[PDB]
Amino acid sequence: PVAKTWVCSKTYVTPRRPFEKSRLDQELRLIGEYGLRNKREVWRVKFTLAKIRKAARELLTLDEKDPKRLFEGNALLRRLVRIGVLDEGKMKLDYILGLKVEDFLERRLQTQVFKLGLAKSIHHARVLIRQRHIRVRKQVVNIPSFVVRLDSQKHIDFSLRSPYGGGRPGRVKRKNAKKA
Amino acid sequence: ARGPKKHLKRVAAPKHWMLDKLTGVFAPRPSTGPHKLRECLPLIIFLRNRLKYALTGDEVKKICMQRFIKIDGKVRTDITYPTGFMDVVSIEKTGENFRLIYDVKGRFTVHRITNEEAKYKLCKVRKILIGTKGIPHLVTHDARTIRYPDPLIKVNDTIRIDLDTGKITDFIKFETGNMCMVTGGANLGRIGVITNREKHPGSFDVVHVKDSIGNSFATRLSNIFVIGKGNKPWVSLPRGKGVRLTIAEERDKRLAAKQSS
Amino acid sequence: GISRDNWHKRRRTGGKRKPVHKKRKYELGRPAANTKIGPRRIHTIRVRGGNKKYRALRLDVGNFSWGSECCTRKTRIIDVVYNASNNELVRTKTLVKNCVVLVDSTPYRQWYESHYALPLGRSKKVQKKFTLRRKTAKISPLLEEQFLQGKLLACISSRPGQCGRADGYVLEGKELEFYLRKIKAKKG
RNA sequence: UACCUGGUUGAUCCUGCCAGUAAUAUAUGCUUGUCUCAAAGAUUAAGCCAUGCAAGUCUAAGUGCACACGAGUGAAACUGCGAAUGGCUCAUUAAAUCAGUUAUGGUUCCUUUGAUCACUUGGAUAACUGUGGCAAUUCCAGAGCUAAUACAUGCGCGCCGAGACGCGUGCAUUUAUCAGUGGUGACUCUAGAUAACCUCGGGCCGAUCGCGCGCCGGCGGCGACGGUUCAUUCGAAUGUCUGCCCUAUCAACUUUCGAUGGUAGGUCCGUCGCCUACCAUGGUGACCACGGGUGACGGGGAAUCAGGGUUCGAUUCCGGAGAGGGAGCCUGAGAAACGGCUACCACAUCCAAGGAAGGCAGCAGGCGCGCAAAUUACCCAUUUCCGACACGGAGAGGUAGUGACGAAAAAUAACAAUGAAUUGGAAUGAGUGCAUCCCAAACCCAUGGGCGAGGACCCAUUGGAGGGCAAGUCUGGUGCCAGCAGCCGCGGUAAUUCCAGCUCCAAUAGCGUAUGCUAACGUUGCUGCAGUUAAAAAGCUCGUAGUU
RNA sequence: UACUUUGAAAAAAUUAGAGUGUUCAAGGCAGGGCCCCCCAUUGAAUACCCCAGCUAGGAAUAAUGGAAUAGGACCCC
RNA sequence: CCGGAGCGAAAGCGUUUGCCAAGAACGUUUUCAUUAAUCAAGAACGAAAGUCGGAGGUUCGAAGACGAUCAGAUACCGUCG
RNA sequence: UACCGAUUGAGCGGCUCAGUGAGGUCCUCGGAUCGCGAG
RNA sequence: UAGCAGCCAGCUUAGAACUGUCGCGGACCAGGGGAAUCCGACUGUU
RNA sequence: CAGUACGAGAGGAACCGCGGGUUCAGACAUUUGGUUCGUGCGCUUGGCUGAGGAGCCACUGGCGCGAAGCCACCAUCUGC
């Protein structure tokens, strides 16, 4: 008997067809367009959508005005609008079945810092996040998969210690200044 | 096993104690006392997790051994004392008096009462034993035996007794229309008046309770604790007495409060 | 040792069952007391929970009661005459429950001659009291025959193997007539 | 994601399986830079174990005339209370365990809570002192003392009869009798009374310790501890109803020697064929008894799933069971206890050969067994438990070490001109020390500043490239050889399949293989398969259970 | 009395799921806001838990009983 | 005569006549009023061949003998059986 | 690779008949020894 | 009326206690057994 | 004697002396064992003397122990 929990769940799932050409093209297209490292990040965001769609699909089975459907349905809808993947105009349980994997891939931290003009390309966006350059509301984030919500959208900027923003130069800037 | 157990696992502890998972393997097994193991709250939990006056179990030992805590007027030095329903905890160092009453949900509350209210408590009669020489006795829910009671007190009524004297000052007749509090079974903490008492000979009697907002419910007879005569309570009711706002009603109450905070 | 468990018995269907555990201590049994008739010898044994039981091994005196009247006098036991379980307990003179014994009758005729002032086994205010009692003083003929011999036919209603006392009552009424024909059928 | 593809033929449409495909289990091959979390001698062997450790325990308050000390501080011992909890393993165990349900008005219960109930006696003993035995042990013996919270002693009603006493102080205990204070669906309940009983191996009414001196030999302050009888609480035992896998190549089983029931008793904490004695001849079974098998502990659960299902559950939570194999008992509130004892069996240790002693399916570690599983480490600081206790102890537990069982995050480059080991300046990590933080001390992470990248030599592997199945009519070698290949096949001197070079593909700090398991499989079909000819309807009819 | 609906009752952990920026996530049950405290009753929900047993409604469907050798049901009294 | 005709639960059943019991269908404004359908372990019947005990034994004919045929022929064909 | 096979084939386990039966526990009495009692 | 009273009559069976030196069908009476081969079936006869 | 002579080793003697034994021979009964109809003592089955006591009968009723004799490399002693 130990004071541990031993709870752990996977975040992705491998496809049934290992070498389906029609699948490899659309997954590689998502990798290069959003600057991903491997196919696991594609299968992860697909598994994330599958959990949300399955949760909404269960609520569509329940009839309207149900205390469980009204509570869990409104909680799931407001949670999607919070992260920005769902619009405020039409927040219904049936529009969750019209969500694509690209909607979640646009809320990552590497894609937001690229759209905000702070980074040159999408690949340049991921390399500076891992190098402790950008922050979100005075919080330095080192993870590119940081799902930015709408409340923290206008607070993504460079850190107060990075040379890109306002701070001391890097190790190789002063190194070249000392030698010459 | 070969005898009585002395340990208690933290995951096997009652859920209403609100104990976490990664702090330790064992939970404080409440020592033997007036209240049952599943229906009480140890003194260590009340001072460390509820009041947060002590951060560890050793500090609770130092708090109790200085003779500061006193349950029902008597000073206690056992950190695992089973402080149960309607019990009074007096802290003369800070002038604080607590009475363990359930929440709107099935959990105990840090409910501070005044000094004049801390002088008494409410005890539910369990049995009436006729001792030697025809002397009647009252067995309350906290094992208190009181001799020569009012002959109008019956097997399911409550009495208001003093903590220093130990005698009955008044009592509430268990009948319809009187206020009652549920002490377990998916309705723990709800307060309402009694409407009907179904009698099933040979099994448990289920009564029907209706709160102020009209959300009538039911429970067994062994879970009802009369706390008031009619519609006026004899003890200070906690905030959020027995309404049991649904998960939808609580959500709107929280959102409207965050915007006003 | 001696066990009172039921996991060694066959099931109601008739099939053997296998034991789930060893012999537990809360299932122990102890040998019989076999209370003989002699000088008082009572051994005390500690039982579960720290309590005490009294193993009466030998007994000679017993507090027997009278049914018709109210006369419970500590009297001496002579011998056993009938047992419903088996007649082997009558040979060894074993004192058990619900066994018919021959008890002495001197204190009963002493009380009767001191209460009604009439032979049994052979002031103005005070005389009126006894005359009121003589109106209801007839004894059944089955008892008067026993008082002539000095031996009353009693029945042990106590458990000497548990409490250590061979108490009981005097047989009267239809119960006395039942055990008389049981003994006379054996004596014949 | 409610999915299919190769293979019988010259070709075709089918039944069908073999093969492919994707998770999940252990094991293994190759490979590995950060950070977090975490399983880990279960499978064969409930096999055998060196050594250390794992249960001990003082308050102002049961005893305390050695040390060291101005009474106190501290030891040994006795009296207490614990050691019956925890931990470990899964051998046994198929209405047994267990899970819901429910009863005990068929029971007992240490501790905890509340009720109740002589101004001081007697005799021993340990520690201590001292004489000693044995080859040897938590081995003892002889003698001399002395304490108790040790062990024993002790201060109105019914009868009678001139309406004056005596017995019951009272509660327990046991039996008998009879009038119906307060309860319960329902007492042969709880209380009243009478008659006595009341165990010498006799039930109880404090011959007890504290800090304190305040006053009129006397009354007083506050606490500790102990006992009786009732409550409670932690429970524990024994029952109620329903629910277990495979097997008929197990169809009748049980009953001298208890199987089913009745009666009386014994016994037990209490109920009961639990046992004995006398009677009755029953009890179970085709709705599967009984017997056998289980690589069977049960369940909460786990894996995979469109819906149904299939499989797994030695494993941290609950219950049960057992400490080499069985059996027996002591102490106690609680044990049929084994980190208690006594036997036989197996195994094994020391020995002057007379004897003595042993139980790691506890924590480390060793051996053996195997495809298969880690340090003879640190601390009681957190979590709790035990104890005369705020102070002690705890391999329970916690923290490190080993660790690709697994799960999460996530480097191996980014940005600009010029036609690439070309060039160019920027950017933080890996690593490395130094402070701080962290933590019982340490370690790890995190925060700073000082070093730290140009083949940013600080180099990404693992399987494939005929089809299924994403990817070379390339080049050299071999010539049905060596080898490849899950399947179909390839190699017969011009091999897209072998051995290599180059190139390419897939997933990626992983990946291949072997064996189970799941979906594939509507190839076990309840949902949902088939039986004219591909495997298949008894030769036919009657006939009870069963189903309808 | 099967079915059906409701209620009572039920160990947690696990699963589902509400809230909450451990830098994100697996997870945890904590923590958020203002200048020695106060407010957010700071929070630490809720659902599921087969079958059987218990309880209260419904009376379709499927079984089952009632008067036939009548003294059968009500009265009379 | 003898049929893609009849009957029987199937196997099976073909001269005339008599006897015994049974059966389907049809007819009915008769009667009983659910008595029914299919049915594990059970049971009746069941071609030909084969077995046992008797009677019988015309034809046919396993085995076997012989005559052919053939490379061989213990086969096909033929004569006895 | 299984099968039949004289060899009362051989080995290793489970539950038991009968006999022998260690060691506890109770019951009867037995009194080394100690101050009628404890033993 | 779940039959009782009186009287008479033998011979067997079962169980139990106690007891002698564990001896007890105490003399007498009174099958050794098992696994196989050969021959003849068996009883009978010579 | 001796692990010596001898032998490269591996291996490996003999005389004197000492202590026993094999086979055989001649005896012997203290001891152990066999026998026991001193029919010695106890017990016991069936029957018989009326019973107790004491005894008898069953070609030695049976059983346990057993003196004296005799006896065995089955005990012991001697052998130039």
Ligand SMILES: [Mg+2]
């Ligand atoms: Mg032969």
Ligand SMILES: [Mg+2]
């Ligand atoms: Mg021969």
Ligand SMILES: [Mg+2]
């Ligand atoms: Mg012959």
Ligand SMILES: [Mg+2]
């Ligand atoms: Mg040599």
Ligand SMILES: [Mg+2]
């Ligand atoms: Mg001799």
Ligand SMILES: [Mg+2]
């Ligand atoms: Mg004789």
Ligand SMILES: [Mg+2]
């Ligand atoms: Mg003769």
Ligand SMILES: [Mg+2]
């Ligand atoms: Mg003879």
Ligand SMILES: [Mg+2]
């Ligand atoms: Mg002899």
